[PDB]
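Entry type: protein chain
Record version: 2
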Amino acid sequence: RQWALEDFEIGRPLGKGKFGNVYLAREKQSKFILALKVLFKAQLEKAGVEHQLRREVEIQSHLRHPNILRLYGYFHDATRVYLILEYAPLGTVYRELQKLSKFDEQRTATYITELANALSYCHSKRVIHRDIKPENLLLGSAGELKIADFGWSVHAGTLDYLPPEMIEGRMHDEKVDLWSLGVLCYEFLVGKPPFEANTYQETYKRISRVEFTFPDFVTEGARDLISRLLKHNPSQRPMLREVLEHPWITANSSKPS
């Protein structure tokens, strides 16, 4: 952490967010490579997502896990607010999916394993995640998957990754995470989310109905796991331990539980 913008040399823009840009950066005193996220206070207040941001930063701060992107610290200008983040050199899972069209079973199972580990750790800390997107998944130097969005919750846009209970306005719990796994496991293997449609309304209906089909190249194990994850009823969804111990996972995953 630092107290000012002058503590960092700003490098190439890693990406542009809706509220502000992210840069590659180096802490001058220690030559420390990190990611510097810039946000505008006015923009945050326009949506009133300021308090949400503060809470999410607070939650993220207490999370220490190899498969979760680290928040080193933060400061403000004003107007600008700066987040100091772990730099993931291998970019997003989204871009990787864009490059490889789809992932093989081993890579998919591995990513799912890392995800389930991180989320299990979060559940131990009574931390529940919102929707998980591939653009919000980064890759470390060893290619390790890292959850990078700060969408956490402590109390019990595109709809592609939201569970039925959240889009229907029903009460949601930790089970949400498992649903996300399902979607991701599908997308990794197929190249597109299972409820993708050209229309928001269509996607809404397809999610609410849990209306999806498998391409022929999807194996029985993958179909089984995904089908168990994509339950309309959150209660019928398995636990993360059952996921980590799923035959298909254990058969294809490189990383242990």
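Comment: Residues 22 and 193 are 26 Å apart (CA to CA).
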